[PDB]
Amino acid sequence: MLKLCGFAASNYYNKVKLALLEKNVPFEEVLAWIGETDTTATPAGKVPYMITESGSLCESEVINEYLEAAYPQTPLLPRDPMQAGKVREIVTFLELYLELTARELYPEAFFGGKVSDNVKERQLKLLSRYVPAFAKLAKFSPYVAGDTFTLADCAAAVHLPLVSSCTKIIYGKDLLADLPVKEYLKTLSERPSVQKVNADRKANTELMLSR
Template sequence: MIKLHGFAVSNYYNKVKFVLLEHGIPFEEVLTKLPLAEAKLAESPGGKVPYIETEQGFLCESEVIVEYLAARFPEKRIFAADPWQAAKERELITFIETHLELVARELYGEAFFGGKASDEVKATVEKRLNRYVASFKRLAKFAPYVGGEQFGVADMAAFVSLPLVGMATQKVYGRDFLAEAGVDWKAYVKLVSERPAAQRVGADRKAYLEANA
């Protein structure tokens, strides 16, 4: 059985968990907090979560894990069967994670953990997010799902990451960059939350936060 290492507040951990739950792939959760102990760096060389443990060894980086799951369990159809649609799903995931969430992550210290971002960091992040939020808005469909009428793997990435971008920019700049661009991520998250797998991810995240308050 696949073992998923990490903790329920990590959005990338929750993305992988969402994929596993949504597609009925058996797995076991292994609570693994940061920073990783030196011995654990052999399992996740970058010292990050999530990572998985399989009969063949360890694998890290959430999107690499998802690609592995898609290849190992082709019958689950994690990505769309049509090559073009599958590529468009990967395109959306790249925009969400690389161009939005990873950029906004530089604000998390101030937004969520009581730190302070420098004026230089804020200015740089604002410039990059303004560019890529507009790009994402042109790419995403929200009709009603991020890629169109069908729920898919890109929604699992959007569900766990878009709220962080919206909340971080609201707290640091006093305005939600996504909402300001017309991306109603709150309504979208509410829609996705109707799925049992999303409800499980959300409930476990809430329970973890309450237990570690």
């Protein structure tokens, strides 16, 4: 049985969890806090990581690509190369330009730290460019990349709420406000995978901050 390692307070962990659940791949969840990870499976100590009989993988999108390839029964990518491209493009744009941009701010927004005004100013200029660019790509019809649920949704379902929260705190504005995110999440809310992931997330987040 494949082991998904990390913690449900992690959005990238939840991205993989969503894929696993949607595809009906059996898996075991392993609680591995930062600093308590398997450095042979995850050499830079990042979560999530996956351990199987055949090996380990330590980057969430790499994992999800592996799942697509290893478990073809319920595909989460379109068959057509271009269409699959458009899904991947939405994921990448999302993670590289929205999530990672916002992530520079998380120490302050979420973990009681401080980030400089210079950093804040930098990230805002990026987000101001990147959000409208992402809106150009996203479909929300009703799913992020179109009329079906894909790997892009696995990513959007977990990243969008965090980018929103983060920006509201730092900038006093939800920089995703002009996107149909509330309606998107409502669409997702109905899904059992999403319900489990969100319930687990809240539980782990409480646990993590109790510590």
